[PDB]
C-alpha cells in the first residue's frame, strides 16, 4: 500500500512478472472460477440424468407397452436377464450420486471464496492521488514514480498527473491459457526470485501486502480444482456402468440375439 526502501531498481523482468501476476489474478476472478464451478456441478447433473435414463429404459421394459414397443421380442428369460443387468447398472450409478453432489456443494462455496480472494488481489485501478487503488493495481500504479525503475513503458492516461503506472500490454507476456493452481504458484515464485528485497531500515519499493490475498487465492483455487477432480473422478465411475446400460439397450433395439445382448454388456 505504501512505498519503502528496497534492494535494487525494478528490472523489466520484475515488471513482466508483476503483470503476469495481475493478468492471472484477473482471469481467475472473471472466468476460471466460474468454469470450474459449472463443470463441477455438471457432474451431479449428468449422474442424475443417467439415473433418469435408466428409469426410462426400465419403464420401456415393463410398463403400459412392454410387450409391444420393440422390446416385445424379448422372452421372459431375456426379460429377467435384462432386468438383472439394468438393476446392477442402476445400483452402480446410484452408488456415485452422493459423492458428486457433495463435490458440487463444496465447489459452490469455494467459487465465492476464490472469486472474492482473486478480486481483492487484483484491485480496482482507481485514481490513486484522489482515491487509492488496490492490490496489484495499487502496486503497479504507485511503484515507479519519477530513477527507481529503468527499462519500462508507462501508461499514457490523462489521469496520470503524477503517476507512472506500468503498461502491462508492453511487457509482451505470452497469452498462455494455463490458469491452474501451479500457474499462479509458478508466477508467484518468479516474483519472489526477481522481487527486490526490502531494505532493513536508496531505491524505494512497494510493500507486499497484496500477497495476503493472492497467496490465499492459490490455496482456495487449489481446493476448488480438487473438488472438480473429485467430481470428475465420480463421473468416471458412472461411465463404466452407464456404457453397459447404453450398450444393452442399443442391441435389443436392433433385435439382436440375447447372446449378443449379454455379450455386449460384458
Amino acid at each position: 500500500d505504501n512505498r519503502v526502501p528496497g534492494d535494487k531498481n525494478l528490472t523489466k523482468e520484475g515488471a513482466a512478472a508483476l503483470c503476469k501476476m495481475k493478468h492471472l489474478a484477473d482471469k481467475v476472478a472473471e472466468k476460471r472460477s466460474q468454469e470450474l464451478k459449472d463443470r463441477t456441478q455438471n457432474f451431479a447433473g449428468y449422474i442424475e440424468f443417467e439415473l433418469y435414463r435408466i428409469d426410462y429404459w426400465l419403464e420401456k421394459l415393463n410398463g403400459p407397452k412392454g410387450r409391444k414397443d420393440g422390446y416385445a421380442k424379448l422372452s421372459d428369460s431375456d426379460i429377467e436377464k435384462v432386468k438383472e443387468i439394468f438393476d446392477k447398472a442402476k445400483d452402480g450409478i446410484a452408488k456415485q450420486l452422493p459423492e458428486a453432489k457433495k463435490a458440487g456443494e463444496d465447489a459452490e462455496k469455494l467459487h465465492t471464496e476464490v472469486k472474492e480472494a482473486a478480486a481483492n488481489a487484483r484491485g480496482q485501478d482507481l485514481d490513486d492521488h484522489k482515491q487509492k487503488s488496490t492490490g496489484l493495481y495499487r502496486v503497479l500504479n504507485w511503484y515507479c514514480i519519477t530513477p527507481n525503475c529503468d527499462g519500462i513503458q508507462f501508461r499514457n492516461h490523462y489521469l496520470s498527473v503524477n503517476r507512472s503506472a506500468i503498461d502491462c500490454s508492453s511487457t509482451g507476456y505470452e497469452e498462455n491459457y494455463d490458469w491452474s493452481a501451479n500457474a499462479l504458484q509458478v508466477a508467484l515464485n518468479s516474483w519472489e526470485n526477481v522481487k527486490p528485497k526490502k531494505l532493513e531500515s536508496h531505491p524505494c519499493t512497494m510493500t507486499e501486502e497484496w500477497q495476503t490475498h493472492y497467496k490465499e487465492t492459490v490455496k482456495k483455487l487449489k481446493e476448488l480444482e480438487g473438488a472438480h477432480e473429485k467430481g470428475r473422478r465420480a463421473h468416471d465411475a458412472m461411465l463404466g456402468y452407464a456404457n453397459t446400460a447404453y450398450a444393452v439397450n442399443t442391441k435389443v433395439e436392433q433385435e439382436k440375439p440375447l447372446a449378443e445382448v449379454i455379450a455386449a454388456a460384458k
Binding site: 443417467e50 435414463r53 426410462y56 458412472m238 461411465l239 452407464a242 456404457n243 446400460a245 447404453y246 439397450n249 442399443t250 433395439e253 436392433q254
Partner: peptide, 13 residues
C-alpha cells in the same frame, strides 16, 4: 434419450 452415448457421443445405426 435414445441416441446419445453416456459420454455424449451420438451414434448412427
Amino acid at each position: 434419450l435414445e441416441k446419445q452415448k453416456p459420454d455424449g457421443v451420438f451414434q448412427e445405426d
